Amino acid sequence: DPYDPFPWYEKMRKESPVYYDEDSKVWSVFLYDDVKRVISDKDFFSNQFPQLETFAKTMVSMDPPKHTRIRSIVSKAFTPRIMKEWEPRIRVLTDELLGKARGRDEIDLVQDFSYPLPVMVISELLGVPSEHKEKFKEWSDLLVSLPKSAYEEDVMEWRTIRNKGEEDLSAFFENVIEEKRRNLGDDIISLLIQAEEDGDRLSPDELVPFCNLLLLAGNETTTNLISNMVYSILEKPGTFDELANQPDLIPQAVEEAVRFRAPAPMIVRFVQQDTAIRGVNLKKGEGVIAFLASANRDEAAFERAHEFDIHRHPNRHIGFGHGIHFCLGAPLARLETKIALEALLKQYSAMETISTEPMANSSMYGLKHFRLHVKEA
Ligand code: HEM
Numbered sequence: 001d002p003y004d005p006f007p008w009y010e011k012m013r014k015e016s017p018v019y020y021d022e023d024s025k026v027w028s029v030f031l032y033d034d035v036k037r038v039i040s041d042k043d044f045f046s047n048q049f050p051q052l053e054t055f056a057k058t059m060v061s062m063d064p065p066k067h068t069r070i071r072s073i074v075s076k077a078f079t080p081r082i083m084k085e086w087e088p089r090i091r092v093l094t095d096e097l098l099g100k101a102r103g104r105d106e107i108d109l110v111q112d113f114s115y116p117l118p119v120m121v122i123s124e125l126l127g128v129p130s131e132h133k134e135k136f137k138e139w140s141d142l143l144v145s146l147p148k149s150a151y152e153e154d155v156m157e158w159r160t161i162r163n164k165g166e167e168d169l170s171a172f173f174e175n176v177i178e179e180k181r182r183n184l185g186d187d188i189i190s191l192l193i194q195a196e197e198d199g200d201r202l203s204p205d206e207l208v209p210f211c212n213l214l215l216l217a218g219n220e221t222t223t224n225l226i227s228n229m230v231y232s233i234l235e236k237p238g239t240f241d242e243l244a245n246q247p248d249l250i251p252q253a254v255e256e257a258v259r260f261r262a263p264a265p266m267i268v269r270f271v272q273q274d275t276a277i278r279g280v281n282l283k284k285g286e287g288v289i290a291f292l293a294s295a296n297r298d299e300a301a302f303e304r305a306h307e308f309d310i311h312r313h314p315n316r317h318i319g320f321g322h323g324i325h326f327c328l329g330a331p332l333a334r335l336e337t338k339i340a341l342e343a344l345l346k347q348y349s350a351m352e353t354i355s356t357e358p359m360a361n362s363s364m365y366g367l368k369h370f371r372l373h374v375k376e377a
């Protein structure tokens with residue numbers, strides 16, 4: 001199924017590690033060392049997108065020196081001491097969410113927990129008032145939505161609805177930013193307005209797209225990370241109990257979950273200058289797809305790479321990327337995923353995988369549905 005691409009990754013890692021897809025004229029790297037270099041060697045592999053212009057005004061499609069300046073300003077709202085300030089608040093949202101599924105022996109992890117949590121957390125951290133939370137969730141859904149099919153009529157119908165959602169969401173953020181200027185709070189928008197690098201501040205044209213990027217890059221990744229982590233835990237007997245009895249292994253397990261079932265399987269780069277990888281030449285301009293999922297299953301990088309080992313420490317996966325584009329939200333994803341698993345391991349003494357349905361999203365590795373038989377404590 002689409003939830004087991006790993007045999008194919010292993011095949012590619014052994015048969016065509018650096019593969020050229022003649023049809024699309026795009027490269028694909030699967031070896032850990034090759035993927036690591038493609039996503040980190042900024043001098044030879046760029047993030048800028050020449051042609052085919054969902055990421056464009058964000059720092060994801062930027063290179064230095066433009067990227068460096070915005071990255072150093074947005075980093076001030078995600079420091080370790082800021083993460084500790086959010087912890088208690090995220091714990092309350094999590095308990096409220098898990099609490100609603102009390103009184104049932106079967107739950108759907110996605111619809112009842114993993115999908116709504118990240119939206120609820122980012123909404124709360126962005127200072128979205130409770131009266132506008134329902135409308136904010138709709139906008140977010142439209143932002144991370146994909147068309148029914150590749151049929152051009154279906155694609156054009158979707159673009160119109162998604163472009164209006166983006167316009168209304170952007171306008172909503174535009175007004176919130178101005179309102180927060182005269183009444184600053186502890187919300188991320190308030191923090192970004194006050195952030196300054198020698199007097200250099202983000203403008204409204206850079207602030208609004210960054211807010212959209214937080215939803216775009218953190219909603220489904222976190223949702224899938226939680227889903228994939230729970231699936232990996234229940235897949236290996238005794239692990240659920242092991243984590244419940246020794247709760248300080250959870251962060252390590254979260255890192256192993258990112259290595260075992262990375263929610264973002266591949267990252268995209270564009271050749272900046274002529275170079276080579278494992279006897280094969282890549283010409284400047286060609287698109288490269290670095291498969292993080294395959295790199296984290298590489299047998300030459302990890303011992304017993306096909307086994308979920310919650311005791312691996314340090315974990316050198318590159319599931320959050322590597323280099324100047326290292327996921328800005330990793331501290332929040334790590335915090336949010338830990339709390340989610342802590343809540344599950346406290347509210348339930350036993351959980352059993354009933355059925356799963358993979359997320360149909362091509363560029364994503366996660367579950368649409370995760371039916372679980374559960375026993376409350
Ligand atoms: C939940 C698990 C997540 C995973 C596995 C993940 C993965 C990644 C990866 C691999 C990149 C590198 C992109 C590149 O090199 O082109 C990235 C970038 C980024 N992520 Fe995440 N992400 C996650 C969650 C989040 C969250 C929760 C947020 C925000 C709250 C977030 C915000 C960002 C941003 C802003 C960037 C751009 C960094 C830059 O371009 O400098 N991500 N993410």
Ligand SMILES: C[C@]12CC[C@H]3[C@@H](CCC4=CC(=O)CC[C@@]43C)[C@@H]1CC[C@@H]2O
Binds near residue numbers: 217
């Ligand atoms: C990794 C990522 C999800 C997948 C994105 C990636 C940007 C590049 C990209 C190009 C595509 O056209 C498909 C999605 C991908 C592969 C995103 C940047 C951060 C986000 O989490």
